Amino acid sequence: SVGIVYGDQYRQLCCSSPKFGDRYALVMDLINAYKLIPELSRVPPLQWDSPSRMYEAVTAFHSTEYVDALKKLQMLHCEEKELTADDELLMDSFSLNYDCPGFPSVFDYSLAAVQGSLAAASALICRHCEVVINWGGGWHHAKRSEASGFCYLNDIVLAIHRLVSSQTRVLYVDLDLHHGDGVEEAFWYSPRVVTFSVHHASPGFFPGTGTWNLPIFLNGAGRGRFSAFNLPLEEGINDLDWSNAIGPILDSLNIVIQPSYVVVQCGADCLATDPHRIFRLTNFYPLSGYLYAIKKILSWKVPTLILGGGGYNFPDTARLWTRVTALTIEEVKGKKMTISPEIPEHSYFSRYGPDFELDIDYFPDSIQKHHRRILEQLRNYADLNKLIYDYDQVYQLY
Amino acid sequence: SVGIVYGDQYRQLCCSSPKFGDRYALVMDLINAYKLIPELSRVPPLQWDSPSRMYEAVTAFHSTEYVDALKKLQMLHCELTADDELLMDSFSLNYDCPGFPSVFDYSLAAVQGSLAAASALICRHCEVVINWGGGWHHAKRSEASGFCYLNDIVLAIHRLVSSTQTRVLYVDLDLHHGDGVEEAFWYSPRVVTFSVHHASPGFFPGTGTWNKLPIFLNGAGRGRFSAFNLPLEEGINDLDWSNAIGPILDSLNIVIQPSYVVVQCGADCLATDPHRIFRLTNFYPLSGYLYAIKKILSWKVPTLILGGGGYNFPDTARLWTRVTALTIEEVKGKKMTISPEIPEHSYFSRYGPDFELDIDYFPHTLDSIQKHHRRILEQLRNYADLNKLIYDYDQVYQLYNLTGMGSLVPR
Amino acid sequence: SVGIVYGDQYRQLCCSSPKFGDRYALVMDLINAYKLIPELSRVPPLQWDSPSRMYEAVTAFHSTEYVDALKKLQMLHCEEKELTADDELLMDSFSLNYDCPGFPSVFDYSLAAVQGSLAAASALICRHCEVVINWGGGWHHAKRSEASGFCYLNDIVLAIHRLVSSQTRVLYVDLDLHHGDGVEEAFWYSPRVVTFSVHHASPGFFPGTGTWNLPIFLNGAGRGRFSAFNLPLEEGINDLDWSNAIGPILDSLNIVIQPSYVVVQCGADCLATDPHRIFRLTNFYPLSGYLYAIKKILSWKVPTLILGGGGYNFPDTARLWTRVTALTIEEVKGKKMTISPEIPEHSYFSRYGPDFELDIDYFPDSIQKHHRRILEQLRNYADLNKLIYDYDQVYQLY
Amino acid sequence: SVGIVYGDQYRQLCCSSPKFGDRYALVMDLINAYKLIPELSRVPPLQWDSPSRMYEAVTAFHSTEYVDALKKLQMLHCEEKELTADDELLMDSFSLNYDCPGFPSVFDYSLAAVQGSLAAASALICRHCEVVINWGGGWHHAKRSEASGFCYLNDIVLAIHRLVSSTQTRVLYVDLDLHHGDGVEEAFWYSPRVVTFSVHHASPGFFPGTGTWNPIFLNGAGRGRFSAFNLPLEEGINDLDWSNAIGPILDSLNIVIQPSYVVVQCGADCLATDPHRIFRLTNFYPSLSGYLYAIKKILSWKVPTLILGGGGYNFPDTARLWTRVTALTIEEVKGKKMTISPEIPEHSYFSRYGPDFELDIDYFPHETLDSIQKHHRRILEQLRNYADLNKLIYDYDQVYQLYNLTGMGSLVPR
């Protein structure tokens, strides 16, 4: 069974934000326009018995003063009156400002993705599904008491915390263009959650982390030392180079960690057509670096949560995540999925102009240093955690 | 004549679900142990002449395919493939609404009871009819929800409104938003839904609250202004709850002038419910429940009274037993005195450690909801305009002015 | 066994306040000058496993933001510098000002009285002691989030709450000159704690409550209706009139409520020599209204908490509470306690001049309308709480 | 020679109280299962030639009436004999109640710790041992005439008193326990030749209340003025900040005081996993255990030392800490590498180290204004005052050199 999170109120909440507009509705309507929904198990988003239960779930990672502040932020933006100077000061102290502005449903919007990614984790845990997809989630920048990168609540941290609490190890794979700093930070002292983010990094580029700090590469503290992995890449990298850079790392993490679950953040802003215009990945399925990585992770047969994230060209994000969705269905059920190269007619058909194809409209040694560095960190992690593994099989992956 | 729905097979079926266990048995036996059953006309559950007439009753609201799936789920649990699992999930026959050996017979029994209750009002055998086995307001046309599989309320309202200018007033006192009843009659002016409930972010089911400034949706098309909602913050006690909906209930009866009232009376607003959200009681010198039930019965409009939520089963029995005795008192004009000590009967031991009828609870300018009164009353004036009904400002004003709140009433 | 709370640190902490200076030391050393401590079982004040444990005990009644504010008030008065405007506002919002000022030990001072009255409740409960005395406690004005009348923490509410969660009914008797509002308020909705205060009341006199409010007497709410009792008396009242005014009320409450514990606030500011100069009660034992009432309450043979309270002529409060101690020793153990009419030599002897006597230095129908009102309230309480009581056996006490 | 206090009867008696159960047996069996017992010279607990010599040893510190009452409480609890009302009053007069109840073996239990720590003190005096460990000892709360905090007789005070009157002689007492070592501090409050230093949690309502502001720090009186040192810390401290908190205070105390003996109370309730849940220390040994760091530093001074136990109420984790301390003592003193396997060895109490059966405690250490630099300064000014009063060399330059390693030389008074 492959699961997918949605519901009518959930789609409305995921579409109420000023920054991601209707992206979620394009994504699920293209998945549905391609008749994928009957192949998928609808996973409904989690609801709670009371305010206290919701609070106890969210403050599993977030500080209640921050949860209080984010709820107050919604109240203030549902009135017509300006914030007081005191309330601006309060919001600033949580970075609820600038890139994380308030808006009338910011708290419900932010919490939907928590409700979605918690239900996805539960569906994996009771073994109802082997993979669950949540395209409303994947907000990896949110920190304990701080908004960041338009992430107000870290739904991934919460879902990961719910899987690891059911030895139970989790491997977190972050394919987003940006460094998954909030997730990496939450589990910085924890060795049961190995995080690996591949991203672009360059001076002044958001969020700033995931790279050299001679400067050193930090990678965990305490019992968690060597448990945060990072591959930063320069601009222009295409599908094949990105694939080759990430593939051996993915395979060696699986061999050595033997994760009980895999959580994948699939931010679509690496696409060549994302307005960031940093990377050159595609959604091509002859090969898309995204599809290479999902298929590799799915070949491990570990229960897996696939999450969204960045993606600012909304129709191409829809084009990526549709292919990811059918690829999961193929790989898990074993059932050939035949996708028309033409976009089908549906509500949002006119957004996929002017060509209406499913392919996106794009025509196409420092990594070896990073590879030796990471393999050494993996040996160190295996050492520190009394984990038995063949150095030669793993060293053979490169 | 006050009617009540029971039967032997009825009670075995109401007692057969994993979620609600023997709760219906406790309720009916507490009512029996207080010697109320001789005051009440037994209303027998509806049965049909064929699977085909049954299927026809149930699909007057529910899709044929959701009903087939509910049937298949039950036969399945009496003996699943990847396609079965996908089909069940396609109807939300999972998680909060799981299958179990009698899941279909259990959901159908509430339809039998509530529909039979409806007919006893229509043919005037009963002024009021009670069904503590029914009240399942979350169930959708093609979707199970919140342990609601078939929506007996929608089906009974539908029978009431199809009998021979008939308007039904639907009053939902349950802790949760009656989304299922509200969504079924959303485009219909002759069924007015009113729900008082808790709403807050992440609280089931998420509707019946606010949705430029946010707004209340309240019906569409010919149903504009006919879906009313009063969402309240946690902590409310009997008096503020009673003050909250009392005037709204009289104002709705004055303007709509319904030919029937249907009341879902789920008990999860009790201070002692495991939800621990509202702080209502079953006290009777006052219980916001009894206060509202007594106000509704004072209109002398034929009335269906339905169960619902309530997850402390002894306390739910304590409340519905009192409600039953109140209804006998209000309709027959006949004093029903109920001993504070729970009588000898086979479930006496469930009423511990006190073994008394009042629930074991100790009740102890900002939080008003006067802008809600003002909005709701403006909704009711629109509803009257769209539907060409008399809107009697004087009577409604005089109502709210008893409280000092005439100014909230629009002309 | 009769128990008394003291300890060397406890004594230092009860004596660090600006309002009551060394009273507690005058009290315990006069008890000691009279060879009374060997007859008494020392009940040490309670201490906690951790900050969290202390916080849980104190917020059984007090709000944690209030406890936070009181602790902050101590730290602030252990710094040389002035409070900020923001800190003044904060303290004001808990009435930590005016009559309840900060001082270097205000939190430790307030908390000690709680530690002692909680150790006393516990020695009653485990039955180590039939009666326990804490002259360090009895701060009946402190509310959930508000200091009042130099009371910052309500030790009595907390000791009482510990008694009723050990069916259990507590009778609380408040002999202080002032209305015990905070204790009456804390149990305003509880029928298991019946509070009875007798006090002066007149317009402008602190705290204002405990009297007509044709105004009515409030007496509880909810299931607590009729469970708060009050007898306000005109100024000038003497031992005999006071004794006769309360004596029938006390015997009635006992007969009808049948308390599991009795908690007695015994504030000494009804004394003729108290600077309030309102009542004319003495410590005379030929008869002191205090001694009469204590001895009546003790003849009931219910486990009893005896607490201090007001008392602003320190040597005379010491004179009263010494006699109270000896009476308790005598009434519980059965052995006569010969107390010399002269103050024995000790550390503080010079404070009892210029005559150094144990007797304090003093030469000595509205109540029938109050009695008939209270008797009816008692009947309303009994009827509300399905209690059996011979109406006429009670009515005869008057 | 590293000595350790043990014996069959000693073990039976240290395992006979209600509060500390079989904790001593788990400690000694864990040290035995890691094969450490052959590295160690067993120090037999002291026995006396008569009841009177026992009684005079114990009343070197404790009053005759308190000891007599301790004897009677034990006699009382050995019959069906419920107490007379006067029995009850006598016991309460000594706090032989609540936190220090009677039980059938309360006097033997209490005396056993004195027997171990005195024997250990004799072995340092006659130079048979450079270091001696007693994990049955370290009952720092006991007063002259008062039991306290489940301490009934103060073996620490009695041990220090034997050392300090052996044939100028100064003892440094170092109290790492979660709680203020109030009883050792009171005993020597008027005595310059035994300098007490306690690190601990203090907060309002926390046992036992002393060792903090009073706003000034009291520090001893008359001749003992400035000889009682205290460093109270807020909850939540980890191994590194605690190590950095006391490290330089300890090196400076050793530089100035020049003690002939060090006595270390090493109670384990600062461990992250202690039910007190106040400090966050560990027993880790690669990120280094505050405990091991301080024990390693005290042994580097090469001064004859007594290592005592104390608090510690997670019994498996206490054994994990003390077993690692024992191996490090052997390593520092004998020069002999002690490698301790991360898997708990097979032995009778293996089943108490579940569900991991590892030697590292099951804890995960996670994470300007919390520093305590004013305490360092207050403490160093106190230490200069002690040196003047007592006419000792205050070597400013060495202490400065010491704090300047941290970048904190400016904290050192001239």
Ligand SMILES: COc1ccc(C(=O)NO)cc1NC(=O)c1ccccc1
């Ligand atoms: C501060 O800006 C960001 C912060 C975080 C993310 C992100 O997707 N993180 O995963 C993306 C952005 N980028 C953007 O918000 C952006 C949107 C449209 C065009 C260009 C850029």
Ligand SMILES: COc1ccc(C(=O)NO)cc1NC(=O)c1ccccc1
């Ligand atoms: C999805 O969960 C629900 C869904 C619907 C209702 C309900 O009664 N609606 O009227 C109640 C619940 N509540 C519960 O299932 C619940 C049961 C026991 C304790 C706490 C909560």
Ligand SMILES: COc1ccc(C(=O)NO)cc1NC(=O)c1ccccc1
């Ligand atoms: C606001 O003032 C008070 C508040 C409370 C009490 C009291 O004793 N309560 O029990 C007493 C007072 N009275 C006084 O504090 C006072 C002190 C010296 C002379 C005269 C009066």
Ligand SMILES: COc1ccc(C(=O)NO)cc1NC(=O)c1ccccc1
């Ligand atoms: C009065 O209580 C004590 C008194 C003294 C000490 C102590 O270890 N002193 O060193 C410890 C305690 N603490 C405890 O007895 C305690 C035991 C288990 C859980 C929580 C607390």
Ligand SMILES: [K+]
């Ligand atoms: K990334």
Ligand SMILES: [K+]
């Ligand atoms: K990690």
Ligand SMILES: [K+]
């Ligand atoms: K409702």
Ligand SMILES: [K+]
């Ligand atoms: K409607």
Ligand SMILES: [K+]
């Ligand atoms: K009083």
Ligand SMILES: [K+]
């Ligand atoms: K009361």
Ligand SMILES: [K+]
């Ligand atoms: K210590």
Ligand SMILES: [K+]
């Ligand atoms: K000293």
Ligand SMILES: [Zn+2]
């Ligand atoms: Zn991104």
Ligand SMILES: [Zn+2]
């Ligand atoms: Zn409900």
Ligand SMILES: [Zn+2]
């Ligand atoms: Zn007073």
Ligand SMILES: [Zn+2]
């Ligand atoms: Zn300790």
